[PDB]
Write a protein that binds this DNA or RNA. Structure first.
Ligand SMILES: [Mg+2]
Ligand SMILES: [Mg+2]
Ligand SMILES: [Mg+2]
Ligand SMILES: [Mg+2]
Ligand SMILES: [Mg+2]
Ligand SMILES: [Mg+2]
Ligand SMILES: [Mg+2]
Lengths: 153, 262, 62, 118, 206
RNA sequence: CGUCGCUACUACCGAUUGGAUGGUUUAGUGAGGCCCUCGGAUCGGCCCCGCCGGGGUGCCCUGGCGGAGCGCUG
RNA sequence: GAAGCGUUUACUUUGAAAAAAUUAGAGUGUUCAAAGCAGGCCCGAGCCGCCUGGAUACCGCAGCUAGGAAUAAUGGAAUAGGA
RNA sequence: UACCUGGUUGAUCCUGCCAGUAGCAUAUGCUUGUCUCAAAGAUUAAGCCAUGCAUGUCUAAGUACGCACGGCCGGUACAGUGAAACUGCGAAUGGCUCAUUAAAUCAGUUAUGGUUCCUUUGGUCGCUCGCCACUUGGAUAACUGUGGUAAUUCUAGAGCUAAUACAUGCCGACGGGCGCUGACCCCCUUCGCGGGGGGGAUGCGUGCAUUUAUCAGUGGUGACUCUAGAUAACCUCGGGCCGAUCGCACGCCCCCCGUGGCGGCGACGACCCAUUCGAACGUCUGCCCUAUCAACUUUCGAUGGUAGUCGCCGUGCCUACCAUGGUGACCACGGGUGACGGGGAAUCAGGGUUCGAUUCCGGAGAGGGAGCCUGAGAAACGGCUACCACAUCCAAGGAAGGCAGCA
């Protein structure tokens, strides 16, 4: 439905909502100022994170997380979790004795902020390490690239 | 372990102490101080194994409790006090002063200095911040903090300070061309000139330093410390001038010395 | 625990094939000519030669 | 087994005694020990009963209510000396302290004065 | 005791994890505060590092913030009216970090009367003549009256807060942690947050 | 080459609701510690205030018994 | 000197960092060696003490950095919704 | 040192194993003159233990009225040597063993902008306007004396006596400054008004630390909801700081005077910040055999969201409400391991195959679980509490245990 679908009022703590809206100004509509930040490392915040209305305390841009540690990339596998997706990272493991490699993978649950809308299965995402967001979540999506998509017949 | 460790194994001691492996099971285990234990000299080994003034730790204890060992202008009675980098060990009874500078092999060798030189000591600005009432505070490479520095001194700069006051005498800005010394890793104890610095956000920045023999190496920013302005050092360099020479070169030096002295 | 060293290596290697007429004759001639106590001495000098030759071979391959 | 105040029974009970409760001194800081204590109620089964006279009778008990013995040592804090001797302020305090005389036969007699505090 | 260790949980794959040590001390948990409404009662607990935490078991007074008026007063707490976590917390009247509580409107009413000099929270008046008449009139000079009459323009309060002041009970939100800091600081609900919480209370009982 | 006949050895199957030895969980009981709410055996203080009492002048400077304030508190 | 990459990888080279002991190995006559990290120079005796060492190599895989772009994988504009 | 030899046949070529051959690592047999090193109750039983020891501690600088000595130098608080005891610290290190443990530990890498940290070292300690201070109160040790018990490092009553133990609590800085509130006064366009301001009497709170809410934007990040500012307030009676401490030689000012005011060197102490030592939890990647283990997890947290509780902190760590998710043939899950992991060791063309209980690093454990006190740090066991299993003494009423420490 609306934004406030939870039992408590979802809002950004840094943003103060009631700035004494009185008769000296028209009411309204005074759109609420949006809190956002650049996460550094050259990643540019999306315009959905700039002008959106969602609230996500685990969002890299509009939430209380800081990206530090490792930056990895993966391929979106499933999108059946609330604001989190699982990505698959495929790599090769060297076996010295046989001088050959071993195709391995490791599924990784990552948080996907609502600022990324055109995210589908198979897209290549990059994730950054953050503080533990859940039991098995320690990475947050920073940038999404499509995979031979964007041409829907 | 259920708490902090207060024992150091002889074989687990840092290699630059050059401790042997048969005299004892344990190592001096330097006490906590301004320097990390992995790159500090306990006074016990500095007096026993380096200068051979004392023969045992008991004799080091006697000379320390005789109040004849003064470090950075303050008398230290601690046997396991971390002497650390470029600090001044002063024995006024003998009138002898030393500054702990690494050699070309990356070890604290004895480097005697003049009394008019021992009164001051350079320092690396580890961090800068502001405390209560807007008072700026500067934390150095030692555990020393100084209030009210000039705003032209930033992180990983250098400051020339003096003894017995702890004030700021001069400083070195971090810039290309400034002479610097590597204080950790493989290139430890090599004197050179900062030639370039590449910044890696979220990770360690890497500097490239070329010495007087044309040897250009690289080092993390955390291991880079400046001891001069451009070409002139502000500190009397130890023997060897900090140039690391190839393995054949000390062979040639040894053969020349033994031929001349034979 | 203790401050010992217990660093020790053998200085000789026994021949692969015991009871060779040629090897026994050669070693007996060597010990007769140079007055050695037993075969372990000539084995130790053979091991020294093997070490030296192996080092030279490694350097030459490098 | 010593009897403990407040147990409110006759008999012996096991109690976890911490520092400064009663009937137990800790061998180390924070140590507690479960010990048997006799209850605060008196009955027939007691080796000794400790009794303290509060009001003197009409006649003197032989060797108990007479022949007053002196305290081994007087006040040490200057406030306590002034409290004992009704000193108001700054009147010969160091020489109003009580000096204990030692007069052993095998040694020369002298008097010892305590080191005053505060 | 109560443990916060991660190794008692199943791993990501669902397989069971076997512990490799017994419960260490640093991963301990302690019984809940369950702070109630009543006379002040606070128990000190020693925590890791020798520091001190204030497990507050009963509160009656809390420091709350108007926010819009930038006035913070040490008012009293009436009861608990809403909790996002569980309704039984409201049933048992327990203070937590985000619970919605009623407070007395007297200190903020006094602030408004003494600052803006607009009678607020009073229907008709002439009932508290010795005190409120003095502060509405003040028989003051002309320059400070010129300072006041402009404040009269911006001294406009929303009808929801008007109704709250008329009722005498202000509904507000806790912001501190009763059980960690030993206090119940908070702020008065306003605007769309106040509307949402009001509709939530009406949804619980309307 | 196989049955049959003799002697050894080796595992296998078996009633014993197998027997015994062993190591994880469901339901119930449940020591002990800790937390909370009570609880108050005791130990102090103020109001001592029945009194001798008194100082800037029965208007108590205090030196103590003792009643016990049959209240207020830790 | 600031900014970006005309894809993303794999691969290869360099650099940083990679505990010591042990391994290889430098020097040193332990009386030789296994070892050890010492030791050597003169002394007409006042030498009212001089010279040194306690190297170096290796440290798989993964991670970081800077060059290369052959080989191998993946892509761009086909209803143009193209530059 | 990139190596082979005997054996199937009447004889020959093979395939193929058996045996031979060499090394090391345990045991054992025979033998053993010298000397330098040097492993050594791991394998079976992390089975059970008599006895003795293995953690205590004082400088001039916390507390001495012990006669236990003692100079007295003689009218004096304490000369000094000092037991004992209180206070402080340590006892969470070391040492031993390898039972548990199979993405667990651990190795390398990285992060804590998601936390704590005794001690050392460096900052801060007149930053707050607010009838004891020439110093405030009480108790207990030690000690004297009376005992109880068969027994223990068991203790009771009574009488003392100190703190850098436990408490309490000011002067000084200190003149004020600032933000509100503003009595009123003065200069004001002056005019019949406003007026633009200068002051101000009276009160209200002022500093650091904590918890809120709000405003603004001195430094530094790759990136703060960082830091430093500003405002309105809170600031917990088991309740933060804002020195009632100790030693050393001793000196200056004397107008006012004449007994006071001042001084150096320290030691101890601190709320907070930084450093050192770390610790704790995470990031990426890596582990033996097994499918006669193919589907697991999800009632009882399994995967995620929201808000909370708890914790030093991030987090299903836990609770409530929701969503139905999460992992698998790239071997999940389950089982086994005669599995503690690694640095390493044996063998040595190259590639590998085995062994690492074993002195270094990390982990775990103290007969098996479980729960706690103190402390910065323990789920401690040469700390305590309970159960189980063993096991000691008893006067039978009770008390006392933990050698996988050295022997
Ligand atoms: Mg004193
Ligand atoms: Mg095992
Ligand atoms: Mg091992
Ligand atoms: Mg070990
Ligand atoms: Mg343990
Ligand atoms: Mg302590
Ligand atoms: Mg235990």
């Amino acid at each position: 439905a609306d934004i406030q679908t939870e039992r408590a009022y979802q809002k950004q703590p840094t943003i103060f909502q009631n700035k004494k809206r009185v008769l000296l100004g028209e009411t309204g509509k005074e759109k609420l100022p949006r809190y956002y930040k650049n996460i550094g490392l050259g990643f540019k915040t999306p315009k959905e994170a700039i002008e959106g209305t969602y609230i996500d305390k685990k969002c890299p841009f509009t939430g209380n997380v800081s990206i530090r540690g490792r930056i990895l990339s993966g391929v979106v596998t499933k999108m059946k979790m609330q604001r989190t997706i699982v990505i698959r990272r495929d790599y090769l493991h060297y076996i010295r004795k046989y001088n050959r490699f071993e195709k391995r993978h490791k599924n990784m649950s990552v948080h996907l902020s609502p600022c990324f809308r055109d995210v589908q299965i198979g897209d290549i995402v990059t994730v950054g390490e953050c503080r533990p967001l859940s039991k098995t979540v320690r990475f947050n999506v920073l940038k999404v690239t499509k995979a031979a998509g964007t041409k829907k017949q | 372990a259920r708490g902090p460790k207060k024992h150091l194994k002889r074989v687990a001691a840092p290699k630059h102490w050059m401790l042997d492996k048969l005299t004892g099971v344990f190592a001096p285990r330097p006490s906590t101080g301004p320097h990390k234990l992995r790159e500090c000299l306990p006074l016990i080994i500095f007096l026993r194994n380096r200068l051979k003034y004392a023969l045992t730790g008991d004799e080091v204890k006697k000379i320390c409790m005789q109040r004849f060992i003064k470090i950075d202008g303050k008398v230290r009675t601690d046997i396991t006090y971390p002497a650390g980098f470029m600090d001044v060990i002063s024995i006024d009874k003998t009138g002898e002063n030393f500054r702990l500078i690494y050699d070309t092999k990356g070890r604290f060798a004895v480097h005697r200095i003049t009394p008019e030189e021992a009164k001051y000591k350079l320092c690396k600005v580890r961090k800068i911040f502001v405390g209560t009432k807007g008072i700026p505070h500067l934390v150095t490479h030692d555990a020393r903090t100084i209030r009210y520095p000039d705003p032209l001194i930033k992180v990983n700069d250098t400051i020339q300070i003096d003894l017995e006051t702890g004030k700021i005498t001069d400083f070195i800005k971090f810039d290309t061309g400034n002479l610097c010394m590597v204080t950790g890793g493989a290139n430890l104890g090599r004197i050179g000139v900062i030639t370039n610095r590449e910044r890696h956000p979220g990770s360690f920045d890497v500097v490239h330093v070329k010495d007087a023999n044309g040897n250009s190496f690289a080092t993390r920013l955390s291991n880079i410390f400046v001891i001069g302005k451009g070409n002139k050092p502000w500190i009397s360099l130890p023997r060897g001038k900090g140039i690391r020479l190839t393995i054949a070169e000390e062979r040639d030096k040894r053969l020349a010395a033994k031929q001349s002295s034979g | 625990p203790v401050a010992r060293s217990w660093v020790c290596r053998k200085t000789y290697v026994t021949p692969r094939r015991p009871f060779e007429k040629s090897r026994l004759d050669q070693e007996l001639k060597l010990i007769g000519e140079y007055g050695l106590r037993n075969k372990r001495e000539v084995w130790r000098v053979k091991f020294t030669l093997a070490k030296i030759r192996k080092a030279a071979r490694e350097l030459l391959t490098l | 087994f010593p009897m403990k105040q407040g147990v409110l029974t006759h008999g012996r009970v096991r109690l976890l005694l911490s520092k400064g409760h009663s009937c137990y001194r800790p061998r180390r800081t924070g140590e507690r020990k479960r010990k048997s204590v006799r209850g605060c109620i008196v009955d027939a089964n007691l080796s000794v009963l400790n009794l303290v006279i509060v009001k003197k009778g009409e006649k003197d008990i032989p060797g108990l209510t007479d022949t007053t013995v002196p305290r081994r040592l007087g006040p040490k804090r200057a406030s306590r000396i002034r409290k004992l001797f009704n000193l108001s302020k700054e009147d010969d305090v160091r020489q109003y302290v009580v000096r204990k005389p030692l007069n052993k036969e095998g040694k020369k007699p002298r008097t010892k004065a305590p080191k005053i505090q505060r | 005791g109560i443990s916060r260790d991660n190794w008692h949980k199943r791993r990501k794959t669902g397989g069971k994890r076997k512990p490799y040590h017994k419960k260490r001390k640093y991963e301990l948990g302690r019984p809940a505060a369950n702070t109630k409404i009543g006379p002040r009662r606070i128990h000190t607990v020693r925590v890791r590092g020798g520091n001190k935490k204030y497990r507050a078991l009963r509160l009656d007074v809390g420091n709350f913030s108007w926010g819009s008026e930038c006035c913070t007063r040490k008012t009293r707490i009436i009861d608990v009216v809403y909790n996002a976590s569980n309704n039984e917390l409201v049933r048992t009247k327990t203070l937590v970090k985000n619970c919605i509580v009623l407070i007395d409107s007297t200190p903020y009413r006094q602030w408004y009367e003494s600052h803006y000099a607009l009678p607020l929270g009073r229907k008709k008046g002439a009932k508290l003549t010795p005190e409120e008449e003095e502060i509405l009139n003040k028989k003051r000079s002309k320059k400070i009256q010129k300072k006041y009459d402009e404040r009269k323009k911006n001294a406009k309060i929303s009808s929801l807060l008007e109704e709250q002041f008329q009722q005498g009970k202000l509904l507000a939100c806790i912001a501190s942690r009763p059980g960690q800091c030993g206090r119940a600081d908070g702020y008065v609900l306003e605007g769309k947050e106040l509307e949402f919480y009001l509709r939530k209370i009406k949804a619980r009982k309307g």
